[PDB]
Design a protein around this ligand. Structure first.
Ligand SMILES: CCCCCCCCCCCCCCCCCC(=O)OC[C@H](CO[C@@H]1O[C@H](CO[C@H]2O[C@H](CO)[C@H](O)[C@H](O)[C@H]2O)[C@H](O)[C@H](O)[C@H]1O)OC(=O)CCCCCCCCCCCCCCCCC
Ligand SMILES: CCCCCCCCCCCCCCCCCC(=O)OC[C@H](CO[C@@H]1O[C@H](CO[C@H]2O[C@H](CO)[C@H](O)[C@H](O)[C@H]2O)[C@H](O)[C@H](O)[C@H]1O)OC(=O)CCCCCCCCCCCCCCCCC
Ligand SMILES: CCCCCCCCCCCCCCCCCC(=O)OC[C@H](CO[C@@H]1O[C@H](CO[C@H]2O[C@H](CO)[C@H](O)[C@H](O)[C@H]2O)[C@H](O)[C@H](O)[C@H]1O)OC(=O)CCCCCCCCCCCCCCCCC
Ligand code: CLA
Ligand code: CLA
Ligand code: CLA
Ligand SMILES: CCCCCCCCCCCCCCCCCC(=O)OC[C@H](CO[C@@H]1O[C@H](CO)[C@H](O)[C@H](O)[C@H]1O)OC(=O)CCCCCCCCCCCCCCCCC
Ligand SMILES: CCCCCCCCCCCCCCCC(=O)OC[C@H](COP(=O)(O)OC[C@@H](O)CO)OC(=O)CCCCCCCCCCCCCCC
Ligand SMILES: CC1=C(/C=C/C(C)=C/C=C/C(C)=C/C=C/C=C(C)/C=C/C=C(C)/C=C/C2=C(C)CCCC2(C)C)C(C)(C)CCC1
Ligand SMILES: CC1=C(/C=C/C(C)=C/C=C/C(C)=C/C=C/C=C(C)/C=C/C=C(C)/C=C/C2=C(C)CCCC2(C)C)C(C)(C)CCC1
Ligand SMILES: CC1=C(/C=C/C(C)=C/C=C/C(C)=C/C=C/C=C(C)/C=C/C=C(C)/C=C/C2=C(C)CCCC2(C)C)C(C)(C)CCC1
Ligand SMILES: [Fe+2]
Lengths: 32, 56, 30, 61, 449, 35, 150, 30, 37, 207, 315
C-alpha cells in the first residue's frame, strides 16, 4: 500500500524531472 | 588396435600441428609469399612522408 | 535408371545456367 | 542514531534533485552561468558535504 | 545545436555532426560513460534489494551479483553467502561516481568549448594526425593494463578469488602461484575453437586466468609505451584509412568479435563462471541428470555396467569415440564436460566403475540433483522446461539470458562494422554522396565486362 | 593420410597469405575516384 | 515465389539506393531529389555492370525489371491457390509409393521422408482427440504412436 | 521405372526445347 | 535485502534501473522542442 | 604402456590420445609359466584389446567357398572391453580355469566387408567359463541380443580360446593372446547371422 | 617493368574480367567450388550416415533408393558432437563417410564462401565508385544461414541438430524445431513472417505501379494513384525514400528472424500460453494455444524413436 504509493510518487517525480528542464529552457529562451 | 589413426582430434595442439613438417610448411609458405610481396613492394609506391595514405 | 534421369536433369540445368552466364546477349544502351 | 542518518540522507536526496534540475537550466540559459556561479558552487559543496556526512553517520551506525 | 542546412546531416543522424567538434564529442563520450556507470550502480542496488541469501543466486535471476561473488566478496565455502554489504558498497560507489561523470559530461556538452584544438593543444587532435591518435591509444592501453594488474592484485594479495575447483565445494582462495609459463599461456590462443579444444573457453583453473591477466597487463603497458613514442610505419599507412569513422569501424569489428567470444564463454565455461552462482551450463544439466539417474538406479540395485540400452550401446556407461568411459544415452555429445562435482570420479581412462560404486560423497549427489533440476532450458514467458510443459515454474537460467543478449549485440555490432567501414572507405575515396554524373567511372571502362 | 593433411595445409596457407598480402598492397588507392 | 519476391524487393531497394547520382550537397541524399525532375536519379549502367560482374546476369530494362517484380509473387500465390484447391478434394501429394514399399520390405531403410511420415502420424493421432470433438474420439494411451525409447 | 513416366519426362523436356529453339533461330536470323 | 538503516528507501531503488532508457526518449522530446530542425 | 604408466597419467593427458582404448602391456615377468603358484585368485582389471575383425562370408564367385575376410572398422575406437572382474584357478598339474563375472563385458561394433556391405555385432565374452591347460584353454559365452525389445523399425552362444603367454609371479599381471568366434547381429530376423572371428591380446591382474 | 606481384595484383583487382576476382574472391572461389564438388558427389552417391549416433544409419543419396525431393546430405553423427572431423582424422575414407564428414566439410566451406561473397560484393562496390551498402543488405540471408548451420549446432552441442542439405531435410528440421522450441509463437518468427509477406506485397505493388506509369523515371501520377487508393497522401513521394523503405523492410525482418533462431539455439523458447484460461472452480479451459500444444506434444513423442533413454530431453 504505502510502498506502492512512494514508488509511484518517486516514479512520477523522476519522470517529470526530465521534460521540466526542457519546458523551463523553452520558457526562458535557452539554447536548446 | 585394429588400425592406425592420427589421434589428435581433442588434443588441442597449437595451430593443429602434431608433426614438425606441418610447421615447416607453414613457415616456408608464409616466408615465400612475404618475400615475393617484399620484392614487389617497390611498385606500390613509398609512403616515406609522414602524412600520406588515404585519409579524410 | 531414375537416378540417371535426375542426374541428367541437374546437369542440363547447370549447363543452361553456365551458358546464360557466359554466352549471353551483350547489353547495349542500358 | 538512525534518525539523524535518515534525515541527512533525505536532505541529500532533495539537494541532488535540485541540482539535477538546476544545473542544465543554468548552463543552457544564455548569460546565466556568469551570474549564478555562487549558487552552483554552494549546491555542489553542500552535496559533497552531505554525502560525506552520510558516510560518517553510516560508519557510526 | 546545429541544423541540416549548416551540417548536411538530418536529425536522425544528428550525432554525426560531432565528427569535427572535439569538445562536444568528448562531452558526449563522458556522458555515455556516466550512463554506463549509473546503470551498473542502479542495477546492483536493485538486485541487492531483491536478493534472498537463503536461495541460490541463479534461482532469482541475478546477473551482476554473481560477478562480485566470483571476485570473492561476502562468500563462504560452497558458494554460501555470509553478508551482502560489499554488494551495497559497490552499488553506491558506482552510483555516486556516475553522478560525477554525468555532471562532467553535461558540462563538456553544453558549456565547454566546441573545439579544443587551439585552447588546449594537448587534448586537441586531428583525425588524420597519425601521431596524436597513437598517443591516445597508448594512454588507454596503459589504463587497461593497470586495470588488469588491479585484478591480478585482487586475486593475489587483497583477499582472493572464488576457486570452484578447490577440494570439496569451492571457496575463496589466494592464487599464490599463477601460471606465467609462456607456452601454457599462449597454447590457449592458438588452440582450435571446435569441440574438445574450445579455444580460450577451455580455461579450467584460476592459476591460468591470473597468469594470463599478468601477461596481458604487462603486454598492454609495454604496447602503450611503444605507441606513445612511435608513429605508424609506411606499410601501416599504406593499408589503413585514417579518419574518425574508420577508427570507429575498427573498434566496432573488434568489439563484435568480443561479444561473440563472451557469448560462447558464458555458455560453455564454468571456471570463470562458477555454477554455484550462474547455475549449471547446458552440458552440465544433462551430465548431472545422467549421474543422478545412475546413482539412483545403482542404489535401487542394478548392474550399471551390464545395462544394455534399447539400441544396444549401453543405458548408463559407454565408450567415447576416443575411448574414454562416458555416460550413455543422448548425452554422448556432452562427453567432454568437466566439473568439480564429477572429476573425483574420473580415472586415467574416463569414469571409474569402482569409484562410482563406493566413492560418491553426499554433497556431489545433492549438487547433481540441484543442477539437473534447474536446466538452462526456458521460455520467453519465464516458464522453464521444454516447450510442452505446464505453467508451474518461473525459471530461466542467467546463462541463457547472457548468451542470447550478447550474441545479439555482437551480431548488430558486426553489422555496424560493415556499415561504418564501407562508408569510411567510400568517404575517404570521395564518392560517398553519389556518382559524379559527369565523370562516371563505368562509362570509361571497356564494355562486355 | 598425413600427406593429405600436408597438401591441405599448403593450399590453405598459400591462399590465406595471398589474401593477407593482397590488402597490404596499397589497396585503398585502387578506387577510381579523384583525390 | 514468395521468397523470390522478398529477394527482388531487397536487391532492388539496395541497388537503387547504392547507385544514386550526386544531385546535391551534404550527406543526406534523401533531400537531394526533386519529384518534378525529368532526369533519372540512379545510374542504370553502373548497376547493370556491378550485378553482371558479381552475379553473372543483370537487368538492362527498367520495364522488364519492374514487371518481373510484379510477376514473381503473383505466380507464386496463384500456384499455391491451385495446390490448396487440389487439397480441398483430398488429392494429396502425401506419399512416394516406391519408398514406402522399400521401407515396408526392408526394415533397415530409413530416409528423412519416412521420419516425416512418422511425425505426421504422431501429429494426427495426438491432435485429433481434441481438434475434432464431433468424432468423439477416445484413444487409449496404449494405442497412441510414441517413440518406444522414452 | 514405368515407361509412361520416362516418356512423359522426355517429351516435356524435348518439345518445348524444340519450340523455343525454333523461335530463337527465327529471331536471330531476322 | 538492503541494510535496515536504508530499508525505508527501498521503493526508490525499484525505479532506478529503468532511468537510462528514459534518457533516449528525452532526446526525442528535445528534438520536438526545436521542431526537428 | 604398462599398468604403472597408465595409472600415472592424469585424465587430461589421456583424453584425445586413444590410450584409454588400449590395453596394458606386460614388460616384466617371465615366459616360463612355471612360476604361477597353484590356487585360486580374484581376477581384477581384466582388459581385452582385439587386433583383427575377420568375418566369415560366402564367396561371391559361384565356384568359391565361404572364407574369413578382412573388414574395415567404422565405429571410432569403442571396441575394448575393460574393468572385467571374475575368478581364475590354476592347478598344480597344469590345468587351469577362467571365469568372468562382471564389468564392461560387451561393446557394439560395426565393420564393413569389401563390397560395401556393413555388418554390426556385439563383441562380448560375458559369462565366460573356460577350462583347460595354460596354453589352449577353451570355453563358451553368451551373446545378448544386439538391440533391446523396445527398439522399433522406421540364447546365442559363442566359443573362445585364451592362452596365457607371460606371467609376473611377484605381482600377478598375467598376459596372453586370445581368439574367439561369435555370431553377428541377428535383430529383426531380416538375415541369417554371420560368424565373426576376433583375435587379440588380453591382460589381467589376479594379484 | 613491374614485378611479378605487381602484375598479379593488377590482374586480380581488375574490373575488366568477366567475373570480378576480388581479394575476397581469392578465398571465395576455392571454398565455394570445393563445397559444390563435395555436395554434388555426396548427393549423387554416398553411403548411409549414422546421424543419430545409435548405430542405425539413414540413406540420403540418389544411388541408395532416393529421389530429388527426399535426397539430402545427412548431418554429422551425434557421437562426433562438436568435434572437428576432417578427412585426415579418420582411419579410413569409408569411416569418414559413415560418421558424416561431408556435411561438416560442406558447411564449413560454404560458410567461408558466403562470408567472402559478401566481402567481394563490398569490394566490387568500392572499385566502381558506388555507395557500399549492398553487402549490408546481403548480410541478412548470410546471418540466417549462419544461424541455421552454425549457431544452432553450437547451442545444442552437436552438428546432428543442424539443417540437412536436402529438401525433405528442411521440412524435418522445421517440424523438429517447432516441436522442441515452439517457433510459431515467438515474436521474432512473427516479425520474420511479417517481413517476408510485406516484401512480397511491396514488390508486387511497386512493380505494378511503376509498370503502369511507364507510358510511351516514375512520374508523379503513381503517387497520386497510391494516395487516392489507400488514403496515405505524401506517405511516399520521394523515389529515394521509397526504394530505401523497400530495401529496409525485408532485411530487418530477416535479421530479426535470424536473431530469434540464434536465441532459441540457447534454449530461450517462444511464448507459452497453455493452461492460462481457468474456470472459477479451477478447471482448465482449452484454447487454440492448447491445440498447438497438443500438436507439439504429438511431434515430440515421435521425435527420436530410439535415441533418448531418460524422461526429459535435456540435450
Ligand atoms: C598470420 C599469423 C601467424 C601467427 C602469428 C605470427 C605473428 C608474427 C609477428 C611478427 C611478423 C608480423 C608481420 C606482419 C605482416 C606485415 C609485414 C610488413 O608489413 O613488412 C613491411 C616492411 C617493409 O620493409 C621496408 O621495405 C622497404 C622497401 O625495400 C625495397 O627498397 C629498398 C631500397 O629503398 C631495397 O632495395 C629493398 O631491397 C627493396 O625491397 C625498405 O627496404 C625498408 O628498409 C624496409 O624496412 O618489412 C618489414 O617490416 C620487415 C619484415 C617484418 C618481419 C617479417 C618476417 C617474415 C618471416 C621471416 C621468416 C621467413 C622464413 C622463410 C624460410 C623459407 C625457407 C624454409
Ligand atoms: C504489446 C506489444 C508491444 C510491441 C512493441 C514492444 C516494444 C518494446 C519491446 C520491449 C519491451 C520490454 C519490456 C516490456 C515487457 C515486459 O513486461 O517485461 C517483464 C520483465 C519481467 O517482469 C516481471 O517478471 C517477474 C518475474 O520474472 C522474473 O523473476 C523470476 C523469478 O523466478 C525469474 O528470475 C525470471 O527470469 C524473471 O523474468 C514478475 O512476474 C513481475 O510481476 C514482472 O513485472 O521485465 C524485465 O525483465 C526487465 C525488462 C528489460 C529487460 C532487459 C533487456 C533484456 C534483453 C534480453 C534479450 C534476449 C534476446 C531477445 C529476446 C528473445
Ligand atoms: C565464425 C567462424 C567460425 C568460428 C569457429 C567455429 C566455432 C565452433 C564452436 O562450436 O565453438 C565453440 C567454442 C567453445 O567450444 C567448446 O569449449 C568447451 C570447453 O568446455 C570445457 O572447459 C570448460 C572450462 O570451464 C568447462 O570445464 C567445461 O565443462 C568443459 O567441457 C568444450 O570443450 C566444448 O566441447 C567445445 O565445443 O566457442 C569458442 O571457441 C569461442 C570463439 C568464438 C566463436 C564464436 C562463434 C559464433 C558463431 C558464429 C557467428 C557468425 C555471425 C555472422 C553474422 C553475419
Ligand atoms: C559505439 C558504436 C557506434 C557509434 C559511436 C556510432 C556512431 C554513429 N553512427 Mg553508427 N552504428 C553502430 C554503432 C555505432 N554508431 C551499430 C552497431 C550499427 C548497426 C545497427 C550502426 C548503424 C548505423 C547506421 C545505419 C547509421 C549510423 C550512423 C551513425 C552516426 C549518427 C548516429 C545517430 O545520430 O543516431 C541517432 C539515433 C537514432 C536515430 C536512434 C536509433 C534507435 C534505434 C531504433 C535503436 C533502438 C535500440 C533498441 C532499444 C534496442 C535494439 C534491439 C536490441 C536487441 C539491440 C554516428 C557517427 C548514421 C550516420 O550518419 O552515418 C554516418 C547512419 O546512417 N550507424
Ligand atoms: C547518450 C546518447 C547521446 C549523447 C551523449 C548525445 C550528445 C549530444 N548530441 Mg545527440 N542524439 C542522440 C543521443 C545522444 N546525443 C539521439 C538518440 C538522437 C536522436 C534524436 C540525437 C540527435 C542529435 C541531434 C539532431 C543533434 C545532437 C547533438 C548533440 C550534442 C549537443 C546536444 C545539445 O546541445 O543539446 C542541448 C539540449 C538541451 C539544452 C536540453 C536539456 C538537456 C539536458 C542536458 C538534459 C540533462 C539531464 C541530466 C539528467 C542532467 C544531469 C545533471 C548532472 C549535474 C547530474 C551532444 C554532444 C547536436 C549537435 O551535433 O551539436 C552540435 C545536434 O544537432 N544529437
Ligand atoms: C587494442 C590495442 C591496440 C591497437 C588498436 C593497436 C594498433 C596498432 N598497432 Mg599496436 N600494440 C598493442 C596494442 C594495440 N595496437 C599492444 C598491446 C602491443 C604490445 C605487444 C602492440 C605492439 C605493436 C608493435 C610492436 C607495432 C604495433 C603496430 C600497430 C599498428 C598496426 C597494427 C596492424 O595492422 O596489425 C596487423 C597485424 C598483422 C598483419 C598480423 C597478422 C594478423 C593475423 C591474421 C591475426 C592472427 C590472430 C591469431 C591467430 C590469434 C587469434 C585471435 C582471435 C581474436 C582472432 C596499429 C596502429 C605496428 C605499427 O606500425 O606501429 C608502430 C608495430 O610495429 N603495435
Ligand atoms: C564473420 C564473423 C567472424 C566471427 C569470428 C568470431 C571469433 C572467432 C575466433 C576464432 C579463433 C581462432 C584461433 C586460431 C584457430 C586455429 O589456430 O585453427 C587451428 C585449426 C585446428 O586444426 C585441427 O586441429 C585439430 C586439433 O589439434 C587436429 O590437430 C587436426 O588435425 C587439425 O586439422 O585449424 C582449422 O580449424 C582451420 C584454420 C584455418 C581456417 C581458414 C581461415 C581463413 C582466414 C581468412 C582470413 C585471414 C585473415
Ligand atoms: C561467383 C558467382 C558465380 C555465379 C553464381 C550463380 C549465378 C547463376 C545465374 C543464373 C541466371 C540464369 C538466368 C537465365 C535467364 C537469363 O539469361 O536472364 C537474363 C536477365 C536479364 O535480362 P535483360 O534485362 O537483358 O532483358 C531485357 C528484355 O528486353 C528481354 O528480357 O537476368 C535476370 O532476369 C535476372 C534474374 C535471374 C534469376 C536467376 C535465378 C537463379 C537461377 C534459377 C535457379 C537455378 C537452380 C539450379 C538447380 C540445379
Ligand atoms: C537516480 C535518482 C535521481 C536522479 C534522477 C534523474 C536524473 C532522472 C532523469 C530522468 C529523465 C531524464 C527523464 C526523462 C524522461 C522523458 C520522457 C519520459 C519522455 C517521454 C516522451 C515520449 C514517450 C514521447 C515521444 C515522442 C515525441 C515527443 C516525438 C516523437 C513522437 C513521440 C510521441 C514518440 C536523484 C538524484 C534525483 C534522486 C532520485 C533517484
Ligand atoms: C548530452 C545530452 C543528453 C544526455 C545527457 C546525459 C545522458 C546525462 C547523463 C547524466 C547522468 C548519468 C546523471 C546521473 C546522475 C546521478 C545522480 C545525481 C545520482 C545520485 C545518487 C543518489 C542521490 C543516491 C542516493 C541513494 C543511495 C546513496 C543508495 C540508497 C538510495 C538512495 C536514494 C538514498 C541527451 C542526448 C539525452 C539530450 C541532449 C543533451
Ligand atoms: C588473459 C587470458 C588468457 C590469455 C590472453 C592472451 C594471451 C591474449 C592475447 C591475445 C592476442 C595476442 C590477440 C591478438 C589478436 C590479433 C588480431 C586480432 C589481429 C588482427 C589483424 C587484422 C585485423 C589485420 C587486418 C589486415 C591485414 C591482414 C593487414 C593490414 C590490413 C588489414 C586491415 C586488411 C588466458 C587464455 C591465458 C587465460 C584466460 C584469459
Ligand atoms: Fe523501382
Amino acid at each position: 500500500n504505502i510502498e506502492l504509493a512512494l514508488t509511484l510518487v518517486s516514479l512520477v517525480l523522476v519522470v517529470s524531472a526530465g521534460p521540466l528542464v526542457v519546458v523551463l529552457l523553452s520558457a526562458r529562451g535557452g539554447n536548446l | 588396435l585394429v588400425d592406425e589413426r592420427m589421434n589428435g582430434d581433442g588434443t588441442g595442439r597449437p595451430f593443429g600441428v602434431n608433426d614438425p613438417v606441418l610447421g615447416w610448411v607453414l613457415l616456408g609458405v608464409f616466408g615465400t609469399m612475404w618475400a615475393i610481396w617484399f620484392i614487389g613492394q617497390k611498385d606500390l609506391g613509398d609512403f616515406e612522408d609522414a602524412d600520406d595514405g588515404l585519409k579524410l | 535408371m531414375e537416378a540417371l534421369v535426375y542426374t541428367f536433369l541437374l546437369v542440363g540445368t547447370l549447363g543452361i545456367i553456365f551458358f546464360s552466364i557466359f554466352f549471353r546477349d551483350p547489353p547495349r544502351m542500358i | 542514531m538512525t534518525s539523524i542518518l535518515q534525515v541527512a540522507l533525505l536532505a541529500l536526496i532533495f539537494v541532488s534533485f535540485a541540482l539535477v534540475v538546476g544545473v542544465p537550466v543554468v548552463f543552457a540559459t544564455p548569460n546565466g552561468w556568469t551570474d549564478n556561479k555562487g549558487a552552483v558552487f554552494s549546491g555542489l559543496s553542500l552535496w559533497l558535504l552531505l554525502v560525506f556526512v552520510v558516510g560518517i553517520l553510516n560508519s557510526f551506525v | 545545436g546545429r541544423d541540416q542546412e549548416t551540417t548536411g546531416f538530418a536529425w536522425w543522424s544528428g550525432n554525426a555532426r560531432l565528427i569535427n567538434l572535439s569538445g562536444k564529442l568528448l562531452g558526449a563520450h563522458v556522458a555515455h560513460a556516466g550512463l554506463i556507470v549509473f546503470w551498473a550502480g542502479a542495477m546492483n542496488l536493485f538486485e541487492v534489494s531483491h536478493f534472498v541469501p537463503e536461495k541460490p543466486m541463479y534461482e532469482q535471476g541475478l546477473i551482476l551479483l554473481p560477478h562480485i561473488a566470483t571476485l570473492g566478496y561476502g562468500v563462504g565455502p560452497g558458494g554460501e553467502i555470509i553478508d551482502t554489504f560489499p554488494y551495497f558498497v559497490s552499488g553506491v560507489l558506482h552510483l555516486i561516481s556516475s553522478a560525477v561523470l554525468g555532471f562532467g559530461g553535461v558540462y563538456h556538452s553544453l558549456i565547454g568549448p566546441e573545439t579544443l584544438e587551439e585552447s588546449y593543444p594537448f587534448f586537441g587532435y586531428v583525425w588524420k594526425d597519425k601521431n596524436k591518435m597513437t598517443n591516445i591509444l597508448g594512454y588507454h592501453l596503459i589504463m587497461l593494463g593497470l586495470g588488469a594488474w588491479l585484478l591480478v592484485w585482487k586475486a593475489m594479495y587483497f583477499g582472493g578469488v572464488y576457486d570452484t575447483w578447490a577440494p570439496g565445494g569451492g571457496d575463496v582462495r589466494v592464487i599464490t602461484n599463477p601460471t606465467t609459463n609462456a607456452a601454457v599461456i599462449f597454447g590457449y590462443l592458438v588452440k582450435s575453437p571446435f569441440g574438445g579444444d574450445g579455444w580460450i573457453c577451455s580455461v579450467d583453473n584460476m592459476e591460468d586466468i591470473i597468469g594470463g591477466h599478468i601477461w596481458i597487463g604487462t603486454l598492454e603497458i609495454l604496447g602503450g609505451i611503444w605507441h606513445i613514442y612511435t608513429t605508424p610505419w609506411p606499410w601501416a599507412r599504406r593499408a589503413f584509412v585514417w579518419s574518425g569513422e574508420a577508427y570507429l569501424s575498427y573498434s566496432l569489428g573488434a568489439i563484435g568479435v568480443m561479444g561473440f567470444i563472451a557469448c560462447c564463454m558464458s555458455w560453455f565455461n564454468n571456471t570463470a563462471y562458477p555454477s554455484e552462482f550462474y547455475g549449471p551450463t547446458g552440458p552440465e544439466a544433462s551430465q548431472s541428470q545422467a549421474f543422478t539417474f545412475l546413482v539412483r538406479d545403482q542404489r535401487l540395485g542394478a548392474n550399471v555396467a551390464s545395462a544394455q540400452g534399447p539400441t544396444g550401446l549401453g543405458k548408463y556407461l559407454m565408450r567415447s569415440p576416443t575411448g574414454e568411459i562416458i555416460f550413455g544415452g543422448e548425452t554422448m555429445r556432452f562427453w567432454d564436460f568437466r566439473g568439480p562435482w564429477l572429476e573425483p570420479l574420473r580415472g586415467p581412462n574416463g569414469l571409474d566403475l569402482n569409484k562410482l560404486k563406493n566413492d560418491i560423497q553426499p554433497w556431489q549427489e545433492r549438487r547433481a540433483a540441484e543442477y539437473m533440476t534447474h536446466a538452462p532450458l526456458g521460455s520467453l514467458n519465464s516458464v522453464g522446461g521444454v516447450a510442452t510443459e505446464i505453467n508451474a515454474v518461473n525459471f530461466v537460467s542467467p546463462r541463457s539470458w547472457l548468451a542470447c543478449s550478447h550474441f545479439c549485440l555482437g551480431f548488430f555490432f558486426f553489422i555496424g562494422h560493415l556499415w561504418h567501414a564501407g562508408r569510411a572507405r567510400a568517404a575517404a575515396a570521395g564518392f560517398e554522396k553519389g556518382i559524379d554524373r559527369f565523370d562516371e567511372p563505368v562509362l570509361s571502362m571497356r564494355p562486355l565486362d | 593420410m598425413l600427406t593429405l593433411k600436408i597438401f591441405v595445409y599448403t593450399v590453405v596457407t598459400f591462399f590465406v597469405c595471398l589474401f593477407i598480402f593482397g590488402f597490404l598492397s596499397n589497396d585503398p588507392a585502387r578506387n577510381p575516384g579523384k583525390n | 515465389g514468395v521468397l523470390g519476391a522478398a529477394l527482388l524487393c531487397a536487391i532492388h531497394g539496395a541497388t537503387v539506393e547504392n547507385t544514386l547520382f550526386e544531385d546535391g550537397d551534404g550527406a543526406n541524399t534523401f533531400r537531394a531529389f526533386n519529384p518534378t525532375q525529368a532526369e533519372e536519379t540512379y545510374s542504370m549502367v553502373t548497376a547493370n555492370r556491378f550485378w553482371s560482374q558479381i552475379f553473372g546476369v543483370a537487368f538492362s530494362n527498367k520495364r522488364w525489371l519492374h514487371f518481373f517484380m510484379l510477376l514473381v509473387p503473383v505466380t507464386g500465390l496463384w500456384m499455391s491457390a491451385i495446390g490448396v484447391v487440389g487439397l480441398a478434394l483430398n488429392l494429396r501429394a502425401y506419399d512416394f509409393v516406391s519408398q514406402e514399399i522399400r521401407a515396408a520390405e526392408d526394415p533397415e531403410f530409413e530416409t528423412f521422408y519416412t521420419k516425416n511420415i512418422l511425425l505426421n502420424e504422431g501429429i494426427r493421432a495426438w491432435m485429433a482427440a481434441q481438434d475434432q470433438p464431433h468424432e468423439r474420439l477416445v484413444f487409449p494411451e496404449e494405442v497412441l504412436p510414441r517413440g518406444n525409447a522414452l | 521405372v514405368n515407361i509412361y513416366g520416362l516418356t512423359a519426362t522426355a517429351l516435356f523436356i524435348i518439345i518445348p526445347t524444340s519450340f523455343l529453339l525454333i523461335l530463337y533461330v527465327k529471331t536471330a536470323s531476322t | 535485502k538492503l541494510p535496515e538503516a536504508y530499508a525505508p528507501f527501498a521503493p526508490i531503488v525499484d525505479v532506478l534501473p529503468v532511468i537510462p532508457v528514459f534518457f533516449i526518449l528525452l532526446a526525442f522530446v528535445w528534438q520536438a522542442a526545436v521542431s526537428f530542425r | 604402456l604398462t599398468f604403472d604408466e597408465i595409472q600415472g597419467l592424469t585424465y587430461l593427458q589421456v583424453k584425445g590420445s586413444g590410450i584409454a582404448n588400449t590395453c596394458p602391456v606386460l614388460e616384466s615377468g617371465t615366459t616360463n609359466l612355471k612360476e604361477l603358484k597353484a590356487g585360486s585368485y580374484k581376477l581384477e582389471n581384466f582388459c581385452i584389446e582385439p587386433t583383427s575383425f575377420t568375418v566369415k562370408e560366402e564367396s561371391q564367385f559361384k565356384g568359391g567357398e565361404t572364407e574369413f575376410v578382412k573388414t574395415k572398422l567404422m565405429t571410432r575406437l569403442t571396441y575394448t572391453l575393460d574393468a572385467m572382474s571374475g575368478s581364475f584357478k590354476v592347478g598344480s598339474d597344469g590345468s587351469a580355469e577362467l571365469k568372468e563375472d562382471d564389468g564392461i563385458d560387451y561393446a557394439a561394433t560395426t565393420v564393413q566387408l569389401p563390397g560395401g556391405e556393413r555388418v554390426a555385432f556385439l563383441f562380448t565374452i560375458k559369462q565366460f567359463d573356460g577350462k583347460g591347460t595354460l596354453d589352449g584353454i577353451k570355453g563358451d559365452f553368451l551373446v545378448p541380443s544386439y538391440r533391446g525389445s523396445s527398439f522399433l523399425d522406421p540364447a546365442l552362444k559363442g566359443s573362445a580360446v585364451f592362452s596365457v603367454a607371460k606371467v609376473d609371479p611377484v605381482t600377478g599381471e598375467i598376459a596372453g593372446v586370445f581368439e574367439s568366434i561369435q555370431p553377428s547381429d541377428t535383430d529383426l530376423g531380416a538375415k541369417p547371422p554371420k560368424d565373426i572371428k576376433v583375435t587379440g591380446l588380453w591382460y589381467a591382474q589376479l594379484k | 617493368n613491374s614485378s611479378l606481384w605487381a602484375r598479379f595484383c593488377e590482374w586480380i583487382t581488375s574490373t575488366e574480367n568477366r567475373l570480378y576476382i576480388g581479394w575476397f574472391g581469392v578465398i571465395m572461389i576455392p571454398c565455394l567450388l570445393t563445397a559444390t564438388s563435395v555436395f554434388i558427389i555426396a548427393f549423387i552417391a554416398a553411403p548411409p550416415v549414422d546421424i543419430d549416433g545409435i548405430r542405425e544409419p539413414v540413406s540420403g543419396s540418389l544411388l541408395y533408393g532416393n529421389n530429388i525431393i527426399t535426397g539430402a546430405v545427412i548431418p554429422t553423427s551425434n557421437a562426433i558432437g562438436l568435434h572437428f572431423y576432417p578427412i585426415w582424422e579418420a582411419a579410413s575414407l569409408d569411416e569418414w563417410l559413415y560418421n558424416g564428414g561431408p556435411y561438416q566439410l560442406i558447411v564449413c566451406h560454404f560458410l567461408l564462401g558466403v562470408y567472402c561473397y559478401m566481402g567481394r560484393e563490398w569490394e566490387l562496390s568500392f572499385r566502381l565508385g558506388m555507395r557500399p551498402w549492398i553487402a549490408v543488405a546481403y548480410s541478412a540471408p548470410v546471418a540466417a544461414a549462419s544461424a541455421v548451420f552454425l549457431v544452432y549446432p553450437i547451442g545444442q552441442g552437436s552438428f546432428s541438430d543442424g539443417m540437412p542439405l536436402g529438401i525433405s531435410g528442411t521440412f524435418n528440421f522445421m517440424i523438429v524445431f517447432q516441436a522442441e522450441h515452439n517457433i510459431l509463437m515467438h515474436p521474432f518468427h512473427m516479425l520474420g513472417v511479417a517481413g517476408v509477406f510485406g516484401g512480397s506485397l511491396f514488390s508486387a505493388m511497386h512493380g505494378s505501379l511503376v509498370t503502369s506509369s511507364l507510358i510511351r523515371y516514375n512520374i508523379v501520377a503513381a503517387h497520386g494513384y497510391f494516395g487516392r487508393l489507400i488514403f496515405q497522401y505524401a506517405s511516399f513521394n520521394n523515389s529515394r525514400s521509397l526504394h530505401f523503405f523497400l530495401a529496409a523492410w525485408p532485411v530487418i525482418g530477416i535479421w530479426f528472424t535470424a536473431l530469434g533462431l540464434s536465441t532459441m539455439a540457447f534454449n530461450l523458447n517462444g511464448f507459452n500460453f497453455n493452461q492460462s484460461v481457468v474456470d472459477s472452480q479451477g478447471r482448465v479451459l482449452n484454447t487454440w494455444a492448447d491445440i498447438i500444444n497438443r500438436a507439439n506434444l504429438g511431434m515430440e513423442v515421435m521425435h527420436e524413436r530410439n535415441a533418448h533413454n531418460f524422461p526429459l530431453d535435456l540435450a
